[PDB]
Write a protein that binds this ligand. Structure first.
Ligand code: HEM
Ligand SMILES: CC[C@H]1OC(=O)[C@H](C)[C@@H](O[C@H]2O[C@@H](C)C[C@@H](N(C)C)[C@@H]2O)[C@@H](C)C[C@H](C)C(=O)/C=C/[C@H]1C
Length: 393
């Protein structure tokens, strides 16, 4: 039983060697996450892609040996933590809001938010800033908050709750944060009743009130929570991890600067090279599963390591090479199967507009600290930085 906790920041900063080491012996391994969670890891691209879409692996806690806590049980009635038919029904409720055509209409506004954030950033007399605080965090929370209808003065509370979910001081902090967020969402939800709002939450509230059978109040709350949190810590880290990748690879940054039509390709390679999701969300086998000899008992917690999949040579030649011109087709940065990220088009839009704005307005943009000085968060499911110092002329 490998204990990831005893590996420290060394493993947090560069977990790849550890994963590949495990991939060499087999596809599934038992480990102890930093928080003390005894879980299973699935490494290797082929096995990883298969498991993500293998119906034998449920996301419904009723099939999990580990029980939900009281505060967690208040938010699990959402699509990411359910199997069909519930999943089918819940996702249908919002699929239409996230199509590429629907998201494209948001381009003008996303552009506004980015230009404003960059305007403010370039106001620094020293030509220095923390990209995490100036853009990576502000952009994502602003967009999703406007789509759902979260008042501006309430958006700060989320960075706090979100942090307590990722790198909580103690187990209790996370639980308290959930209870608070849970209480806030219920109040936000109730405040929309009778107000004729046209934001997504208001529509959902109307749907639930009209027929509690199509969307129960537990699910309304669950839906509001998943849409706000599943795309927060992820888009934030994509922007930051992606810019770090570019800034730590001068040659690639130059090629993109020279030819901006490589942008879309650059963004995909960022997802594949330094995607924010190191490990997918909890899966629980509904029956004992045998992965090439290793048997994962029913009920155990399983984590598909997307990061290791992205470094499998057979799938991505010269894995450790960050190449924006590389063939990325097949990466699992957004998952695979029925739970495939519903916010992918919106994630891609924000990332594309943010990367272009920095390259075209920050002359001689450069990393303002050495790669080795950067600090990464411990949590195995999330790949993200504590801060990203940058500078320009
Ligand atoms: C670059 C940013 C993003 C990445 C890399 C990402 C990644 C993922 C991944 C890996 C999954 C499935 C994981 C699993 O199967 O356990 C997923 C699911 C999901 N994502 Fe994203 N996501 C991002 C942005 C977004 C955005 C912007 C939203 C919100 C608008 C969002 C909403 C969701 C939801 C609600 C699900 C559940 C889908 C379902 O269960 O049917 N994601 N995302
Ligand atoms: C969709 C990929 C990202 O994951 C999340 O957003 C997960 C689902 C979210 O997980 C947990 O949030 C709690 C508030 C409720 C809990 N459930 C038991 C009711 C749910 O599993 C994040 C808060 C967890 C991780 C740490 C994260 O920040 C994002 C990870 C992405 C992989």
């Amino acid at each position: 039983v490998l204990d990831l906790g005893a590996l420290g920041q060394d493993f947090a900063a560069d977990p790849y060697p550890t994963y590949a080491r495990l991939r060499a012996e087999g596809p599934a391994h038992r480990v102890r996450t930093p928080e003390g969670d005894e879980v299973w890891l699935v490494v290797g691209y082929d096995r990883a892609r298969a498991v993500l879409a293998d119906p034998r692996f449920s996301k419904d806690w009723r099939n999990s040996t580990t029980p939900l806590t009281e505060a967690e049980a208040a938010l699990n009635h959402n699509m990411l933590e359910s199997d069909p038919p519930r999943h089918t029904r819940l996702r249908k409720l919002v699929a239409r809001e996230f199509t590429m055509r629907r998201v494209e209409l948001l381009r003008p506004r996303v552009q506004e938010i980015v230009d404003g954030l960059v305007d403010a950033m370039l106001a620094a007399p020293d030509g220095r800033a923390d990209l995490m605080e100036s853009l990576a965090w502000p952009l994502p929370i602003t967009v999703i908050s406007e789509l759902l209808g979260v008042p501006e003065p309430d958006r700060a509370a989320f960075r706090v709750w979100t942090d307590a979910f990722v790198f909580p001081d103690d187990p209790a902090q996370a639980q308290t944060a959930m209870a608070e967020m849970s209480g806030y969402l219920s109040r936000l939800i109730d405040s929309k009743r009778g107000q004729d709002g046209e934001d997504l939450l208001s529509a959902l509230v109307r749907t639930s009130d009209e027929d509690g059978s199509r969307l129960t109040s537990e699910e309304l709350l669950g839906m509001a929570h998943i849409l706000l949190v599943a795309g927060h810590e992820t888009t934030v880290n994509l922007i930051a991890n992606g810019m770090y990748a570019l800034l730590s690879h001068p040659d690639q940054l130059a090629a993109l600067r020279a030819d901006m039509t490589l942008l879309d390709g650059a963004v995909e390679e960022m997802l594949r090279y330094e995607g924010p999701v190191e490990s997918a969300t909890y899966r629980f086998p509904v029956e004992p599963v045998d992965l090439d000899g290793t048997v994962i008992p029913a009920g155990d917690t399983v984590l598909v390591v997307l990061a290791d999949a992205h470094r499998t040579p057979e799938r991505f030649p010269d894995p450790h090479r960050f190449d924006i011109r590389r063939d990325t087709a097949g990466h699992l940065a957004f998952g695979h199967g029925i739970h495939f990220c519903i916010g992918a088009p919106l994630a891609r839009l924000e990332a594309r507009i943010a990367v272009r704005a920095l390259l075209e307005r920050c002359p001689d943009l450069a990393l303002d600290v050495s790669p080795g000085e950067l600090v990464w968060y411990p949590n195995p499911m999330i790949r993200g930085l504590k801060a990203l110092p940058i500078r320009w002329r």
